[PDB]
Ligand binder design. Sequence first.
Ligand code: BRV
Ligand code: CA
Ligand code: CL
Length: 223
Amino acid sequence: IVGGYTCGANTVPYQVSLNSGYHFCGGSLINSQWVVSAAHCYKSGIQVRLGEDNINVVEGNEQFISASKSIVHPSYNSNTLNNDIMLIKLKSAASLNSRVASISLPTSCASAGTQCLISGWGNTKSSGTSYPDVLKCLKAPILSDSSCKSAYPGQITSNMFCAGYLEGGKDSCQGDSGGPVVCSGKLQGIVSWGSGCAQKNKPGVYTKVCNYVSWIKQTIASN
Ligand SMILES: Nc1c(Br)c(C(=O)O)c(Br)c(C(=O)O)c1Br
Ligand SMILES: [Ca+2]
Ligand SMILES: [Cl-]
């Protein structure tokens, strides 16, 4: 997160860290046994880390649970990032509490101009790199279709939306990838892609979760 703020310990209790020996992506806890992340975050050997603030220090509210299964969206295209969503099933149920909590799935898609919360442990610089220890947050509005498509001509599908600031300096970035965009208390976006980070006229692009809730519900009902 570039240009954001320190969230505050466990104030984003659905935020997870995905760890394969190191933090590599975020995710969102949607019930005690399932995480939503980005398909481009796929890899083997994932451990889900819940209840984190400083990812490099055991502070006492963590739960570390290995993934039993990862399920990439059947129509994910890594070239276009169309359908950039994955489900991760935990080997055991998380114990839900004030600091580890699920976020609701949408029943309606979010509106342009809605102010959302984006969070993660990704890069905090727009050029170069600096990776934080504690969770960072950004408030950002959903942009119009017109602005999103003009920013990224021929690349925005109906399964994507833009959020952030066309003027630059405030965005998500690699390492936030796979993490939440929460709007009105629902998981509406997944950190997916963009050109650099926090560049003028190149806002963040987010997987449009509301398009996937049928697939999510059916998949978790059978796995
Ligand atoms: N207040 C509110 C708004 Br504004 C929007 C929206 O962005 O249009 C949505 Br999709 C919801 C919802 O999550 O149903 C709610 Br609650
Ligand atoms: Ca920790
Ligand atoms: Cl348009």
